[PDB]
Amino acid sequence: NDLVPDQWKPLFNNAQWLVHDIVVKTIYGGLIIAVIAHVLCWAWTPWIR
Amino acid sequence: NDLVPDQWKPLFNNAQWLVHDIVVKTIYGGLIIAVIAHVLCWAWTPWIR
Amino acid sequence: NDLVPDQWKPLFNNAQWLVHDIVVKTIYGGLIIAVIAHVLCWAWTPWIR
Amino acid sequence: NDLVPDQWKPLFNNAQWLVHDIVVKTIYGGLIIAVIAHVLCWAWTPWIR
Amino acid sequence: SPWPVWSGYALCFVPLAAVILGFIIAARFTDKQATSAYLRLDPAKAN
Amino acid sequence: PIDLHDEEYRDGLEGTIAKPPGHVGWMQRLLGEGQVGPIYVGLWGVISFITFFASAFIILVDYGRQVGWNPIIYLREFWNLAVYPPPTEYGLSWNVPWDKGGAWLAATFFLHISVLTWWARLYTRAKATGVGTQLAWGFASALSLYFVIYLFHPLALGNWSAAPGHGFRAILDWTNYVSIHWGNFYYNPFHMLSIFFLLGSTLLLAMHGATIVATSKWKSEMEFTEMMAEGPGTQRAQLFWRWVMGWNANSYNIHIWAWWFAAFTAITGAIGLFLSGTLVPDWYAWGETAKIVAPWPNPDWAQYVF
Amino acid sequence: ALPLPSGETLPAASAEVIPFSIIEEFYKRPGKTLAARFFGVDPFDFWIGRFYVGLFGAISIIGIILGVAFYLYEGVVNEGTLNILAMRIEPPPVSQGLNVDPAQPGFFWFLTMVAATIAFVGWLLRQIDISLKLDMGMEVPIAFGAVVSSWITLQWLRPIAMGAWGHGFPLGITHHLDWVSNIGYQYYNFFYNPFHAIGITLLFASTLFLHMHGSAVLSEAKRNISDQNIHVFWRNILGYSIGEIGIHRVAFWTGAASVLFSNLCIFLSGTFVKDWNAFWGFWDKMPIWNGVGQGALVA
Amino acid sequence: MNWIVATFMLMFVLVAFLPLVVSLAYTWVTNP
Amino acid sequence: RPFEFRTSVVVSTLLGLVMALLIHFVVLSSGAFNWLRA
Amino acid sequence: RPFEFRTSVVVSTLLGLVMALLIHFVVLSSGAFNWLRA
Amino acid sequence: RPFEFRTSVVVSTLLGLVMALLIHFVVLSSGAFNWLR
Amino acid sequence: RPFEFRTSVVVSTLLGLVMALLIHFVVLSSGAFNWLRA
Amino acid sequence: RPFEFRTSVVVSTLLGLVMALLIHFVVLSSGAFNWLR
Amino acid sequence: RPFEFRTSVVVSTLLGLVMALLIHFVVLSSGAFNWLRA
Amino acid sequence: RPFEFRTSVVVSTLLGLVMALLIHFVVLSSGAFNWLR
Amino acid sequence: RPFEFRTSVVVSTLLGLVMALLIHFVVLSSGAFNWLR
Amino acid sequence: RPFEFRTSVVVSTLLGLVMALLIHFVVLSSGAFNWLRA
Amino acid sequence: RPFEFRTSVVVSTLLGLVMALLIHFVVLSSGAFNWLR
Amino acid sequence: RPFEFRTSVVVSTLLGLVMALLIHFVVLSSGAFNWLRA
Amino acid sequence: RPFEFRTSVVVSTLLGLVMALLIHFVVLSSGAFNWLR
Amino acid sequence: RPFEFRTSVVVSTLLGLVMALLIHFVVLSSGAFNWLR
Amino acid sequence: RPFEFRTSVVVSTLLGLVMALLIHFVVLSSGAFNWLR
Ligand code: BCL
Ligand code: BCL
Ligand code: BCL
Ligand code: BCL
Ligand code: BCL
Ligand code: BCL
Ligand code: BCL
Ligand code: BCL
Ligand code: BCL
Ligand SMILES: CC(C)=CCC/C(C)=C/C=C/C(C)=C/C=C/C(C)=C/C=C/C=C(C)/C=C/C=C(C)/C=C/C1=C(C)C(=O)CCC1(C)C
Ligand SMILES: [Fe+3]
Secondary structure (H helix, E strand, O other), X not given: OOOOOOXXXXXXXXXXXXXXXXXXXXXXXXHHHHHXXXXXXXXXXXXXX | OXXXXXXXXXXXXXXXXXXXXXXXXXXXXXXXXXXXXXXXHHHHOOOOO | OOOOOXXXXXXXXXXXXXXXXXXXXHHHHHHHHHHHHHHHHHHHOOOOO | OOOOOOOOXXXXXXXXXXXXXXXXXXXXXXXXXXXXXXXXXXXXXXXXX | OOOOOHHHHHHHHXXXXXXXXXXXXXXXXHHHHHOOOEEEOOOOOOO | OOOHHHXXXXXXXXXXXXXXXXXXXXXXXXXXOOEOOOEEEOOOOHHHHHHHHHHHHHHHHHHHHHOOOOHHHHHHOHHHOOOOOOOOOOOOOOOOOHHHOHHHHHHHXXXXXXXXXXXXXXXXXXXXXXXXXXXXXXXXXXXXXXXHHHHHOOOOOOOOOOOOOOOOOHHXXXXXXXXXXXXXXXXXXXXXXXXXHHHHHHHHHHHHHHHHHHOHHHOOOOHHHHOOOEOHHHHHHHHHHHHHHOOOOOOOHHHHHHHHHHHHHHHHHHHHHHHHHHOOOXXXXXXXXXXXXXXXXXXXXXXXXX | OEEOOOOOEEOOOOOEEEOHHXXXXXXXXXXXXXXXXXXXXXXXXXXXXXXXEOHHHHHHHHHHHHHHXXXXXXXXXXXXXXXXXXXXXXXXXXXXXXXXXXXXXXXXXXXXXXXXXXXXXXXXXXXXXXXXXXOOOOHHHHHHHHHHHHHHHHHHHHHHHHOOXXXXXXXXXXXXXXXXXXXXXXXXXXXXXXXXXHHHHHHHHHHHHHHHHHHHHHXXXXXXXXXXXXXXXXXXXXXXXXXXXXXXXXXHHHHXXXXXXXXXXXXXHHHOOOXXXXXXXXXXXXXXXXXOOOHHHOO | XXXXXXXXXXXXXXXXXXXHHHHHHHHHHOOO | OOOOHHXXXXXXXXXXHHHHHHHHHHHHHHOOOOOOOO | OOOXXXXXXXXXXXXXHHHHHHHHHHHHHOOOOOOOOO | XXXXXXXXXXXXXXXXXXXXXXXXXXXXXXXXXXXXO | OOOOHHHHHHHHHHXXXXXXXXXXXXXXXXXXXXXXXX | OOOOXXXXXXXXXXXXXXXXXXXXXXXXXXXXXXXXX | OOOOHHHHHHHHXXXXXXXXXXXXXXXXXXXXXXXXXX | OOOOHHHXXXXXXXXXXXXXXXXXXXHHHHOOOOOOO | OOOOHHHHHHHHHHHHHXXXXXXXXXXXXXOOOOOOO | OOOOXXXXXXXXXXXXXXXXXXXXXXXXXXXXXXXXXX | OOOOHHHXXXXXXXXXXXXXXXXXXXXXXXXXXXXXX | OOOOHHXXXXXXXXXXXXXXXXXXXXXXXXXXXXXXXX | OOOOHHHXXXXXXXXXXXXXXXXXXXXXXXXXOOOOO | OOOOHHHHHHHXXXXXXXXXXXXXXXXXXXXXXXXXX | OOOOHHHHHHHHHXXXXXXXXXXXXXXXXXXXXXXXX
């Protein structure tokens, strides 16, 4: 747990920190794409009315 | 439980405090978002009348 | 743990790095082919209208 | 793994390199024959139109 | 219309292939675990 | 850390009753054990007892009222008496006459409470005895089917009439009526999967029982000991099933196989029953559109006439 | 570390780590099959791979191959459907009777049904032989014989008793269900058949017993317990524990009994009974209550 | 209906019931 | 002493709850009070 | 002591949740309040 | 302590998810909002 | 720590995939978007 | 590490194959492209 | 001795009770005595 | 003694209660007394 | 003594409650008193 | 030797008997010879 | 000797019995002999 | 030796007999030769 | 070696025989050759 | 290594055979090529 | 002795009771004697 920060040392491991970073970046990209897709779909056909 | 406050030491662990704090912030954000969503839905179409 | 980079030593084995590289290259090629196929299909017949 | 290349020594045996070569040559021949068959079939009757 | 509907596709042919592959895989791994080497009583001494 | 003598011989609430065990004799001769033994009562089971018998009392009193309080006619028509849910009008309302579905709702509510408390009893006793809690999740998988039949399906359809009528003959009628209403469950894919798993479960039970009984001369029925080291009986069973069909298992995998057969049976049945009415109003028409229905132009119908 | 049969790796009884090869070699002991007693020698008394081939193994394999060939031929040829979920393999018409003619349609149904019967009986006899080579009991043959008798009732006894031979089931995937539905609704309320109800009860009890036994055995596999925890658990809930040897006996008996009662009800429904609603007309006329009611409560 | 053939087939079915009964009787006779 | 305080409390609470629920259900189904529906 | 705090908390919470669900369903299905299109 | 953090977290998450799905499906099936036609 | 990383990852991935499939099915079945031939 | 390489490869390959077959069959059955008559 | 006193008593009492109930029910259903409103 | 006092008391009480219930129900259902409408 | 106080109390309480509920139900169903409409 | 004499005898005799029975049955079922009123 | 005399006798006798029963059944089932009328 | 002689002989004999039976049955049922009453 | 000669021979022979039977049956079923009446 | 050579060979060969059979069957069933009548 | 006295008595009594009940019920149902109206 050398690379883990001081705050999250009791919770995280040196190996799990990297995978957590990967997952966080993936979710960030997915959220960006989801927002873009929702905006395009609303521009195409509104669903609330 | 070094980081745990004095009052809540017998009930919480050091690692559990951080997870509890994360859950508390998540619940507070969800509650704010839900209040906003309910206000917009009422402004759109009342369900009681 | 000799052909793996320093960052990914705790996560990767010296024999699985080669397989990972092969998989990454295959996924990249498949993505490029899929993008080209989608562009051609859209130019042929739009599916949204 | 005397006959195996240095890059692929950790992944391949000495008796598996030959079988891999046979499989690769068979797949290449299959790809060439499939390409020819697809070209003749398209020349006979298009399937997209 | 020589083809089935999409709901037919899913509801019929996804579970069927899933069941076939799952049965074959489970049988293979059950046999692997069964035929492995572990503690046993010697048949020559055991009667 | 667990004293079995205490867990079997305590007193009062959180204890046991019927403490002096009985003996039947013929069960000892035919099944190998005949101890009636004590039974636990721990506040998860008193609630089940009270609620189940409240429901039974309601149903039996309604049965009595339906025959004019005539005991002889009560014995006459016991097996064709039922307490049906409210009619199709006033779909999910509770303001119903007692003789027009009022008693059905109360009995069903108490039965739900009883089954949930029984699951709690099973879970708590499994925890308190030191064993795992697989039986609780199996019962959960059957309660899933039960709750789909009695609660979740009448909901999302809009009426209470989509549920059985609490009778010996009423469940058979419910099965027939539900089959006729929604086309034919012979063309329901989840009915097919449930039947596959059910018949597989029966087949596996028969095979396992016969296999263990055949090799019982070498003490093959002591599953707990064989999981530590194999014996001659287990070896003979493995060899037999390897030479018959070419593959076999050990004395630990077969139980996983059986558990998952039963669980899949319950889950697939629940899913099929729920999907039957809300999304596919006619199963035969769906099967025709899916190309899983055989053509049948020129029947020979003389088989089906008297 | 000693590997346990469950999968545990427990650091260190008379047990030891023995490969399966030694056990497989030790227990061969050729020369004790049923055919050896009759003819003095088994023509096929060897193993081909993991399987043991005997006199009846050859008969079973011949029947299997021939039946599969005939089934595919009736369904790919003479029907021209090319898919297996729309095939419809019918017996001869009821008008034809109990006789078979190659020219008339329905002959390959005869061929497939005969080949399947031969294969099933051969499999039963092979199971008997393998049981007899290992000095085991004959329990699995009893259960499988119950199943095979269920087959023979549906495909041989009922058509012969009814005498027209068009009364056997088509061998088609999703199409034998049509036969089941039509037969069940011809004798309306097949629920009200007593033996069908007993069979359904036994089937449901078998499934419940299998789930209970699997849960009970799996709940103690990898724990430090004294082997008597399961008995206390089963006496605290329901107030009775059957024991180790009773559960398998109950399983075998329930499994056999369900199929036995089912074949009984199908045969009885075929010939001796016509309507299962009229079967219960005797109940309300018994002279203990036939005079106690009025209006809708009469009878 | 020919009632002789039907009764014969019924007798065969009741014969098919027999092996389970024999197993039950064997289990009872042993384990005294 | 014949009974424990736990058993008495549990039995009394369960009996009261069941009786209240049953009485409320019967009164609602009778429809003799003009309550919760015309 | 008679009862543990754990058991009391569990029973109280479960009873409250069940009663809330039942009361909501009974009141809304009565068709006497005009909620979500009558 | 009477209850562990893990059990409370699990029960709260399951209850919240079930309630969200139930309320969404009830509102959609009521047909009183003009949502998704 | 109350929960391991593997449990969180597995639950999150399963929930996300199931929700995505369900939402696509519910949106595309409504026939209110004119996608892929109406 | 939390997950091993073989599990990731197996899950990814299975998901890809299933989605590809399902998408081709849905598109073919929709009859909105003029593909294969 | 071939039988115990307890079994004889039990069998005799059960047979007597069942026979008495059966005879009373048959006579009531016969409608041949003008008893309990014909 | 062939029987205990407990068994005799139990059997007698159950038989008496069942018989009383049966007789009251028969008399009420016969409708020959003008009791309870 | 043949019977203990606990068993007698339990049996008496159950019998009394069952009889009272049965009598109220029969009286309500008879419709001869003008009670609850 | 690969096969024993008695095994060959058993196999040959059984195959011949089965084939003879099959051929008589098929010829009779064909109904092309006027045998036993056929 | 390749075959014991006892085994040959038993096999021949059983084969003869089965053949006699089968031939009687087939001849009596035929249309020429209607089960001896 | 990859295979034993007896296994080869047995497999060949079974395959040949099955093929002959299948071919005779197919040709007889096709009715394209006028053999055994057309 | 990964695969034995015997396994390869068995698999190849079974595949070839099954393929030959399937192709003959399909060609016969199609009815595009005027073969065997 | 994660996967042995034999497993890869088996998986690839089976997948290729299954896909080839499925594609041939689909193309024949489409009736869009004028092949086999 | 091949059979016990107890089994003989049990079988005989059961057979006698069953026969008597059957004969009375059959004679009653025949309607041949004018017994009980
Ligand atoms: C609309 C008018 C309706 C009606 C509709 C309802 C409905 C609907 C409900 C009640 C409920 C109740 N009704 Mg009212 N009720 C009516 C008439 C009556 C009459 C009467 C005329 O005699 C009576 C005596 C009652 C009596 C009662 C009580 C039993 C109860 C409210 C008090 C209570 O228990 O608080 C004690 C309650 C609590 C301590 C709960 C506290 C819960 C906390 C605040 C959390 C709530 C959940 C929330 C989602 C949490 C979010 C955060 C997450 C946890 C992270 N009602 C009429 C017919 N009534 C409610 C109830 O609780 O029933 C069991 C209920 O649901
Ligand atoms: C109905 C109107 C629109 C439309 C509206 C939208 C909108 C709006 C959105 C999408 C989104 C998506 N759409 Mg859509 N969509 C349309 C038509 C389509 C069609 C089609 C054939 O017509 C397709 C194929 C898709 C496909 C997709 C996906 C690319 C995407 C959701 C991915 C997902 O599952 O994330 C969830 C997946 C996961 C949680 C799993 C991730 C797993 C990763 C990738 C791999 C892990 C491997 C590793 C080993 C795992 C470890 C753990 C294991 C347990 C061991 N759309 C129509 C035309 N679509 C969404 C999007 O953009 O998302 C970014 C979105 O918000
Ligand atoms: C009304 C005319 C009816 C008829 C109506 C009845 C009825 C009704 C009954 C009989 C019964 C009998 N009938 Mg008559 N019977 C008819 C015609 C016949 C004919 C005939 C050829 O015609 C014959 C042979 C018989 C023969 C018989 C006997 C089998 C039997 C009476 C003897 C007996 O067992 O005493 C031995 C009987 C006893 C020892 C009983 C002792 C019971 C004790 C005294 C307790 C009584 C209850 C008391 C309240 C207990 C209180 C204390 C508490 C327990 C603490 N009946 C006609 C058709 N018959 C009775 C019987 O017992 O059937 C089994 C019976 O109930
Ligand atoms: C109205 C006229 C009706 C009729 C209505 C009834 C009814 C109704 C009943 C009887 C009962 C009986 N009937 Mg009458 N009966 C009729 C005609 C007959 C004829 C006939 C040939 O015509 C006969 C032979 C009988 C014979 C009999 C007996 C078997 C019995 C009464 C004696 C008994 O058992 O005492 C012994 C009885 C006791 C010792 C009872 C003691 C009860 C104790 C005191 C408890 C009482 C309850 C009290 C509330 C307890 C309170 C405290 C709590 C316990 C804490 N009836 C006609 C048709 N009969 C009663 C019976 O018990 O049948 C089994 C009965 O219920
Ligand atoms: C039909 C005309 C009248 C009518 C006529 C009568 C008459 C007449 C009487 C009653 C009586 C009663 N009526 Mg009314 N009644 C009517 C309408 C009603 C309505 C209603 C909703 O309309 C209700 C709720 C009631 C309610 C009641 C009860 C208060 C009472 C019966 C109590 C009981 O069960 O005792 C039986 C109960 C028990 C045996 C259990 C006691 C339990 C104790 C109290 C608690 C502790 C238990 C202990 C801990 C257990 C220990 C052992 C355990 C095993 C551990 N009536 C109408 C209006 N009603 C009776 C009465 O006055 O009773 C006093 C009565 O005689
Ligand atoms: C009537 C015309 C029919 C037809 C009817 C048949 C029939 C009928 C049969 C064949 C068989 C065969 N057919 Mg042709 N066949 C037709 C058209 C064709 C066409 C074609 C392109 O049109 C082809 C390629 C074939 C090809 C073939 C071969 C696969 C095979 C013959 C050679 C063989 O196996 O030798 C090798 C054969 C042997 C080595 C056999 C040796 C047998 C030994 C000598 C024993 C003989 C039996 C004797 C009773 C034993 C007594 C023992 C006692 C102890 C004394 N047929 C047409 C449609 N064909 C035969 C076959 O074997 O099928 C499997 C067969 O039965
Ligand atoms: C009539 C024209 C039909 C057609 C009818 C058939 C039929 C019918 C068959 C084939 C078969 C095949 N077809 Mg073609 N086929 C057509 C069009 C095609 C097209 C195309 C794109 O148009 C292609 C690519 C093919 C390709 C193929 C091959 C896959 C295969 C032949 C080679 C092979 O694998 O040999 C490998 C096979 C061998 C090496 C076998 C060797 C067997 C030895 C010689 C023994 C034979 C039996 C022996 C005599 C028995 C007795 C032994 C005793 C000891 C005496 N066909 C058209 C539609 N095709 C044949 C095949 O074998 O498929 C698997 C086959 O049966
Ligand atoms: C007629 C026009 C049809 C069509 C008909 C077919 C058919 C039919 C098939 C394919 C197959 C394929 N098609 Mg195409 N296909 C069409 C349009 C397309 C389109 C498109 C976007 O339009 C695409 C992307 C593809 C793509 C593809 C690939 C997925 C695949 C060939 C690749 C491969 O694995 O080669 C590599 C191929 C090999 C390595 C095979 C090697 C086989 C070896 C040589 C053995 C052959 C048998 C021989 C008898 C053996 C004898 C010796 C014994 C074994 C000892 N097709 C149209 C709609 N296509 C083929 C395929 O392989 O599917 C899996 C296939 O069967
Ligand atoms: C009315 C004329 C009817 C008819 C009506 C009946 C009726 C009704 C009955 C018989 C019975 C019998 N009939 Mg007749 N029967 C007819 C014509 C015939 C013909 C004929 C060829 O015509 C024959 C051969 C018979 C022959 C027979 C016998 C098999 C049998 C009587 C003897 C016996 O076995 O006693 C053996 C039996 C005993 C010795 C039993 C003794 C029982 C003792 C006496 C106790 C009885 C109960 C008593 C209440 C106990 C009290 C004390 C308490 C226990 C403490 N019947 C015609 C058609 N028959 C009776 C019988 O029992 O059949 C089995 C019977 O019930
Ligand atoms: C239709 C009608 C009429 C209905 C009747 C109306 C009724 C009866 C309504 C009842 C409503 C109720 C009872 C609603 C309840 C809502 C709840 C409990 C929500 C819980 C949210 C829980 C939340 C957000 C929990 C989040 C948990 C998180 C973020 C966990 C995070 C984590 C934890 C803790 C870890 O370990 C490690 C991983 C990670 C860090 C991600
Ligand atoms: Fe077991």
